[PDB]
C-alpha cells in the first residue's frame, strides 16, 4: 500500500543505456522522502510541474534511474542531436515526465560507484551486403537494440562490439561502440519519472 522506492538505494546504479525501471500501481508515494536523501542538482518537467507531479494521482508511475554525469545534463534533452537521446534513453513525449539529476551524499553509502560513466555512441545495423549502415535509434520507453552487446560498463572510450545476425534476421551484423566519462567524487544519478493518467490508484500521502 506504499510504493517502494527502496531498490534505488542499493547497489551500483546502471549506466544510462541499461536504466532500471520501477513500475508502480495501486500504492501511495512520498516523492520528497526519496528526493530529500540526495542533493538534487536539477529538477525539470515536461507537461507537469515539480509541485504537481509530487501530488497528483495516476494510473501508473514509472521511475527510471541510472548513473549520469551532471556535466552532460544538456545531452539529456529531447532536443539534442546527441548520442544520449539517439541511442540511449529517450523519454515519452505522450505522457508527462520529469527529469531529476542528483548527487549522492556521503551518508548515502549503499549506492556504489561504477568505475566510470559510459554510454553508447553508435548502435547501427550493418546490412548483409557489408557496406551500408543503418543507425538503430532508440525509441521512447524502450532499450537500445544494442544493450545486449554492450557491457554493463564500458572499459575504454571507443571500444567496439559486434554481434552477427542469423539469416532469418537478414544477416549482416549488429554493431555498436561505447564512450566513457571520468567518474566524480560522488556518484551522480539521473532519475526519470513518467506518469500516466487513466481510474487512478497511484496517489500521494
Amino acid at each position, epitope marked *: 500500500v506504499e510504493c517502494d522506492f527502496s531498490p534505488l538505494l542499493s547497489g551500483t546504479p546502471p549506466q544510462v543505456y541499461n536504466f532500471k525501471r520501477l513500475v508502480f500501481t495501486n500504492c501511495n508515494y512520498n516523492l520528497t522522502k526519496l528526493l530529500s536523501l540526495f542533493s538534487v542538482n536539477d529538477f525539470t518537467c515536461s507537461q507537469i510541474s515539480p509541485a504537481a507531479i509530487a501530488s497528483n494521482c495516476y494510473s501508473s508511475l514509472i521511475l527510471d534511474y541510472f548513473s549520469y554525469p551532471l556535466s552532460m545534463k544538456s545531452d539529456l534533452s529531447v532536443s539534442s542531436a546527441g548520442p544520449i537521446s539517439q541511442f540511449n534513453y529517450k523519454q515519452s513525449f505522450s505522457n508527462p515526465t520529469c527529469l531529476i539529476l542528483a548527487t549522492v551524499p556521503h551518508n548515502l553509502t549503499t549506492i556504489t560507484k561504477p568505475l566510470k560513466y559510459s554510454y553508447i555512441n553508435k548502435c547501427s545495423r550493418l546490412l548483409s551486403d*557489408d557496406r551500408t549502415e543503418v543507425p538503430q535509434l532508440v525509441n521512447a520507453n524502450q532499450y537500445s537494440p544494442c544493450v545486449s552487446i554492450v557491457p554493463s560498463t564500458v572499459w*575504454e572510450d571507443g571500444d567496439y562490439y559486434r554481434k552477427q545476425l542469423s539469416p532469418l534476421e537478414g544477416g549482416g551484423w549488429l554493431v555498436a561502440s561505447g564512450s566513457t566519462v571520468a567518474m566524480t567524487e560522488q556518484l551522480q544519478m539521473g532519475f526519470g519519472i513518467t506518469v500516466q493518467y487513466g481510474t487512478n490508484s497511484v496517489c500521494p500521502k
Partner: antibody
Amino acid sequence: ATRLEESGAEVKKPGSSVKVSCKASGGTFSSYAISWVRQAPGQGLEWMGRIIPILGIANYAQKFQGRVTITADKSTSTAYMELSSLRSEDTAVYYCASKQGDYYDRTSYAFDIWGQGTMVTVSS
Amino acid sequence: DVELTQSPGTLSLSPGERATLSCRASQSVSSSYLAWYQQKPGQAPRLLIYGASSRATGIPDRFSGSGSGTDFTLTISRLEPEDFAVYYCQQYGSSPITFGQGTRLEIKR
C-alpha cells in the same frame, strides 16, 4: 572460414616508407577489428594500431604515432599498414591480425585470425 | 606501457608432464584482459587462452589459465610432443597492448 592473405616480402632503404597489405576472404570484412603486430627476429611481439573499416578511422600506439598509417578499402576487402622513415630496428615480420565471431567487451584485442606475415627488411 | 615479464625464459620438460608458465605484470591487470599465445618456428602466433575463463575454439582443453592481480599462469595438463613451442602472454586492458618476452618449451632429453 575467414582468412587473411598478406603482401609479399619487400625490401626498403632506410628512410623510405613501406605499404604492407592484408586481404580478407571467406566471409565479410567491414566489421572486423584488424590489428597490425610486428615481430623482430628472435624478438617478441609488438602491437602497432588497429582499424575497424565502418568505424572509419584507425587508432595507433603512441610510440608509432608518427609514422604508421592504417587504412582499409571495403571494396578490396583489403586493409593496409604504412610505415614512414624506416630504420634498421624497424625490420621485422609484420603481422596482420584480427578476431573471429562476435565482439564483447575487449575481446576483439585477442587475435585468433593471423596473416601469413610480411618480412620487411631495411638495409643499404 | 604495462611491462609483462615471463618466466622461466626456457622450460625443460618431457612429454606427459605438467607445465607451469608464469607472467608477471608491472601493474595490476584485470584477468578479463589477459591472453596467451603459442608460437612455433616459422608461423604466426596462435591464440590459446583469453582469460578469465574463455578458451579459443579448436584449442586443446589441456591449456588453462589462472591468476589475478600481478601474477598469471598458463598451465598445460599433460605435454604432448607438439606442445613444445614458444608461449607469449598479452595484456589488453591498458593502452597500448603489450606482450611478453616469451617462454620457450623444449624437450628434456
